[PDB]
Amino acid sequence: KVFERCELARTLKRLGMDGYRGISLANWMCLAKWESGYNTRATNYNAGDRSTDYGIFQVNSRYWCNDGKTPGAVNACHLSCSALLQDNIADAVACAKRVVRDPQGIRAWVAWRNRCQNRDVRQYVQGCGV
Ligand code: NA
Numbered sequence: 001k002v003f004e005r006c007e008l009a010r011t012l013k014r015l016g017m018d019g020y021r022g023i024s025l026a027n028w029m030c031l032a033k034w035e036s037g038y039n040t041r042a043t044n045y046n047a048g049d050r051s052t053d054y055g056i057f058q059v060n061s062r063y064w065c066n067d068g069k070t071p072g073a074v075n076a077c078h079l080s081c082s083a084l085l086q087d088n089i090a091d092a093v094a095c096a097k098r099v100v101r102d103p104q105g106i107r108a109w110v111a112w113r114n115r116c117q118n119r120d121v122r123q124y125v126q127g128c129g130v
Pocket of ligand 1 (some may be wrong): 060061062063064065066067068070073074075
C-alpha cells in the first residue's frame, strides 16, 4: 500500500508515534517519506553486506527482523521480515518503536540525518488535522 501523506499522519498518531521517545510526528513522517515514499512493500537489497531493508521505515534484516538469509543477524523486533511488508503497519510501527529505544534514537537511520535533521519538517504534517 502506498499511503497518502495525511492518511499516514493520522494513522501514526493513533498508533502513538507522536512524541514517542521524544520524536515528533513530523520527524516520523519525514523518515517514512525518504525511506520508502510511504510504500509498505518497499524492499532494498544491500549487496555489499547481504542484508535487506523492509517496509515503510526500511528496517534492516541484520538487526531488526528475521529473513533467514542474512549472515550473523539478530531479530530485535522478534518478527519475520514478511510482517513488515503488510498493508497494515501495526507491526512496522511496533518495530520502529523498538529501534528508537536504542541510544542512537532516530539517528539510527542515516537518511533522517541527511534529509530531516535540523530542517523545517512542519510541511510533512501541515493540513492533516493531527
Ligand atoms: Na535478522
